[PDB]
Design a protein around this ligand. Structure first.
Ligand SMILES: [Zn+2]
Ligand SMILES: [Zn+2]
Ligand SMILES: [Zn+2]
Length: 178
């Protein structure tokens, strides 16, 4: 197994996957690394099994159909994995915890949102469709862009939204377009 967390790239108290060489801090894995379970398989491995069981699941899909899907166990897992892929980028730190807004010439968003809030919402099964999760994720970057206006810090929202969107298209097998 790797000697660093796959998510945050630090050492520490690491749980090792039994079916791949990745390792995780407990609360870096999503869902949090399960209490017992030997063997234990990471989210990466679980996602790969879904694909292997249903190879046609990789054929192109339309985003509008994906968004309307109910949050059955496989969709739940795919959103947890997509959330994790965002935390994998170090720039996710700026969007992880509850923000506050006090900048001359701007007003804070009407509906603040952050990654740990989406993480709790997934854990508490608060989303009934994929659309719920994707709208809260996109809201994080949209709030950032609007608040920071012409400050160059706006770019951090563009950067981490690009990671989200690439991974959304990969995990949900969105039909490739020009
Ligand atoms: Zn970690
Ligand atoms: Zn694994
Ligand atoms: Zn099949």
């Amino acid at each position: 197994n790797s000697n660093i967390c796959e998510v945050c790239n630090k050492w520490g108290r690491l749980f090792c996957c039994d079916t791949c060489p990745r390792s995780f801090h407990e609360h870096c894995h999503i869902p949090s690394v399960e209490a017992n379970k030997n063997p234990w398989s990471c989210i990466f491995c679980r996602i790969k099994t879904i694909q292997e069981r249903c190879p046609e699941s990789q054929s192109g899909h339309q985003e509008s159909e994906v968004l309307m899907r109910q949050m059955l166990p496989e969709e739940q897992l795919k959103c947890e994995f997509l959330l994790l892929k965002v935390y994998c980028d170090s720039k996710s730190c700026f969007f992880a915890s509850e923000p506050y807004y006090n900048r001359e010439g701007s007003q804070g968003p009407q509906k603040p949102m952050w990654l740990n809030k989406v993480k709790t919402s997934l854990n508490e099964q608060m989303y009934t469709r994929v659309e719920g999760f994707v709208q809260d994720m996109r809201l994080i970057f949209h709030n950032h862009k609007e608040f920071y206006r012409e400050d160059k810090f706006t770019r951090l929202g563009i950067q981490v939204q690009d990671i989200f969107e690439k991974n959304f298209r990969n995990i949900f097998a969105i039909q490739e377009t020009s």
